[PDB]
Amino acid sequence: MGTLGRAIYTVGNWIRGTGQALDRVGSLLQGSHRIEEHLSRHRTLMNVFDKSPLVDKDVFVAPSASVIGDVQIGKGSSIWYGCVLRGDVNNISVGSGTNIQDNTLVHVAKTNISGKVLPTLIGDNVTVGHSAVIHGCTVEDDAFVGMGATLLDGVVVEKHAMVAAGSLVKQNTRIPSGEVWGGNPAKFMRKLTDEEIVYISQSAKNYINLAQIHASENSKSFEQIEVERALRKKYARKDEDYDSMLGITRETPPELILPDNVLPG
Amino acid sequence: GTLGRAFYSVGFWIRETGQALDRLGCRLQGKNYFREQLSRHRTLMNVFDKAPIVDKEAFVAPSASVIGDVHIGRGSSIWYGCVLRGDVNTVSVGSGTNIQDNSLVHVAKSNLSGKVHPTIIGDNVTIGHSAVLHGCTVEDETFIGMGATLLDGVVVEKHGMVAAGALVRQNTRIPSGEVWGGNPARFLRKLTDEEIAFISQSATNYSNLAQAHAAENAKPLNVIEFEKVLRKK
């Protein structure tokens, strides 16, 4: 503060002007070839055709996800990094406690080649694996869709049914309850054991828990990010022997401790 | 050329120095805002002089990655999450062509497996969601099913169709009017005339949908959201 503070601030202004001038000169020397980085224009939630996505309070939507148009997402659901939910020509509905994994595409159609064109309906407690493609089809509650699987228009995945990782499910195919289908084209592989039904449920609840920590981290402000960076650096290593000499016990701050429901045990 | 790269390199020295000077100036004023972790994603990215040339009438989603020498024609559209990387060779997209969400159009990263082929996409082409195109040619008015993979040297002739989830092996030629699918991709049947009509009309519909999404994205960034993010506690 005071006169010294003001003088140092003015000198800082001069230094900033000089630095930005040097940056401009360096840009000129590069032949202006470098496209400049800019403010991020990606919108996590966007309207189109006067349709606004309806997203429940406690839904993790990763900032890099794209939720566009007429999309409804229920309680406890999670949309992960790089997901695209494009509800522009038709409706997309996601039930409660359903996870849409990273880099997944969900889309709809305005008019199919033949039959009744239907919206994309994803039920409750559904797991959809990484990089899946869901197009104009219906996934009923407690179903599992493997990573990298493709569901074409009119496909119905029934309750407690599984689509294996990597499968290509042709248009209008029906996956009956209790069966697992896979391959390209997808076809019946075998019945689902009871332990696998329990797995599907477990998948869904584990995701519900994972979504909480990811949502908490992605929503932190600049100041909290800096505070936690400093705290993480301070507690990354230890000298418990010198602490015992000092007669103190350093405790990990609670903002660095994860909840027990996401820990391996 | 070599002189251009030398000046580009020297330019980086000057720029690095100027930005460091600016950070010093901010530090003297007690500002730490340069420490903020802000995304360095660029929708269009140059690799030295190899830069994307995009037509003014083409929609490119902000989250898409266009890297190096990539040409996009009028009325064409690059959708959300798409990646187009032409650095070792070029990638060209014709007019009225849609590249759907999460698709990947790239060339061989190295010439170890031989000369790196370019990727040529003709006019009024549909490239389905999450398709992979790797150093191939896709002629006008063809259909690439979503989730399909086309390897280098492949040629998809006009009105050809690649079924969803197909794996077209290296150097395979897809003849006109034919539907190929499966892993490996094989002849399935002939294309019907209704399918040709749907190819054209779906492409024209995508160009209109592109227009709508480009207008949506071009709207000014909301200042209320900015203030909400700034004033969080």
């Binding site: 005071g2 010294l4 503070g5 003001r6 601030y9 800082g12 | 007690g30």
Partner: peptide, 29 residues
Amino acid sequence: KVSEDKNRNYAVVAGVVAIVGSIGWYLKA
């Protein structure tokens, strides 16, 4: 308008004094 961290300002003065005094030390020797 003003830098408020007093200790930082004092350190800035100390660095400036070191630089200028070093220049004078070289010049007058």
